[PDB]
Enzyme design. Structure first.
Site, short mmCIF file in Angstrom:
data_model
loop_
_atom_site.label_atom_id
_atom_site.label_comp_id
_atom_site.label_asym_id
_atom_site.label_seq_id
_atom_site.Cartn_x
_atom_site.Cartn_y
_atom_site.Cartn_z
N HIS A 118 0.82 -1.21 0.00
CA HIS A 118 0.00 0.00 0.00
C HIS A 118 0.86 1.26 0.00
O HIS A 118 0.63 2.18 -0.80
CB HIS A 118 -0.93 -0.02 1.21
CG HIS A 118 -2.05 0.98 1.12
ND1 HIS A 118 -2.06 2.15 1.85
CD2 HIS A 118 -3.20 0.97 0.41
CE1 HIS A 118 -3.16 2.82 1.58
NE2 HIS A 118 -3.87 2.13 0.71
N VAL A 174 -6.17 20.21 7.97
CA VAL A 174 -5.49 19.47 6.92
C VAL A 174 -6.40 19.37 5.71
O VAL A 174 -7.59 19.70 5.79
CB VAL A 174 -5.05 18.08 7.41
CG1 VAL A 174 -4.26 18.19 8.71
CG2 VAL A 174 -6.26 17.17 7.58
N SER A 197 -7.41 6.36 -0.17
CA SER A 197 -5.97 6.24 0.01
C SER A 197 -5.21 6.39 -1.31
O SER A 197 -4.01 6.65 -1.28
CB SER A 197 -5.64 4.90 0.65
OG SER A 197 -5.93 4.90 2.04
#
Ligand SMILES: [Ca+2]
Length: 279
Positions: free
Chosen positions: A69, A177, A224
């Site tokens: 990943h 963020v 992701s």
């Protein structure tokens, strides 16, 4: 510069419309910037990284990416073939084990490490951090991501793959963020992508081809996968002097493709990461 037959995500980042195949980008390519990939680690030896990647910290027995990943996300940030910022420097921080999981205290420690470790790196164009991870809401995880952002690092985090409001997930729910949702190649919100008012931007997240461990490649999906696109874009835009770490989040939303996405629930931004390159 132009990469023909690029991954659809890269082509999407450089186009106002979907369906294109070429990635158009400035030759600077994020040179002089750095991106901390906070994940399962990076297989720095992958030829796609051209020696621009290296592990700087692990919280487990090995700095090796035994999952793939983290290598995949690092590849989307700045690999030669699959990267947004093809000349950025990649630093791997392994806060997730080879099963892709990591305790919150470990993820917090990795963020604090990046905030300090950047002070001994030569990154004249700026510092980005890609957090392609997250779980349930945590005030301490949110605070750690806010500290990293406050320290002068452009923090991009995944909104999460729960098809729910990202308000209940950390570090996705930390406002300071840049929280990244996922879209597919037909400009729909990815079926799994979290949403909500805390989202700042969407990136290509479905069927993303990038590097994998063992010198290979593979296509996977997730917010992701959208996060390294935005982080690579921030590193790309910071190298161009168009923004800073503290402002890259708003600049990317400022210059995004607006209204192009479908299945965006009311209250979620309809913004797709876009480099506005013209040559
Ligand atoms: Ca935000």
């Amino acid at each position: 510069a132009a990469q023909t037959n690029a991954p659809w995500g890269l082509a999407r980042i450089s186009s106002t419309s979907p369906g294109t195949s070429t990635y158009y980008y400035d030759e600077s390519a994020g040179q002089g910037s750095c991106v901390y990939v906070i994940d399962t680690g990076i297989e720095a030896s992958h030829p796609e990284f051209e020696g621009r990647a290296q592990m700087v910290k692990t919280y487990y027995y090995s700095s090796r990416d035994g999952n793939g990943h983290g290598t995949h996300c690092a590849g989307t940030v700045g690999s030669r073939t699959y990267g947004v910022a093809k000349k950025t420097q990649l630093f791997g921080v392994k806060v997730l084990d080879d099963n892709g999981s990591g305790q919150y205290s470990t993820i917090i420690a990795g963020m604090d490490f990046v905030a300090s470790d950047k002070n001994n790196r030569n990154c004249p164009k700026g510092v980005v951090a890609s957090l392609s991870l997250g779980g349930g809401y945590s005030s301490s995880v949110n605070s750690a991501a806010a500290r990293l952002q406050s320290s002068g690092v452009m923090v991009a985090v995944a909104a999460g793959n729960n098809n729910a409001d990202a308000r209940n997930y950390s570090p996705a729910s930390e406002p300071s963020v840049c929280t990244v949702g996922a879209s597919d190649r037909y400009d729909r919100r990815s079926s799994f992508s979290n949403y909500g008012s805390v989202l700042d931007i969407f990136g290509p997240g479905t069927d993303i081809l990038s590097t994998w461990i063992g010198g290979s490649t593979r296509s996977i999906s997730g917010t992701s996968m959208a996060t390294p696109h935005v982080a690579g874009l921030a590193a790309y835009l910071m190298t161009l002097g168009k923004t800073t770490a503290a402002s890259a989040c708003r600049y990317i939303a400022d210059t995004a493709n607006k209204g192009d996405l479908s299945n965006i629930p009311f209250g979620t931004v309809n913004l797709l990461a876009y480099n506005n390159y013209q040559a």
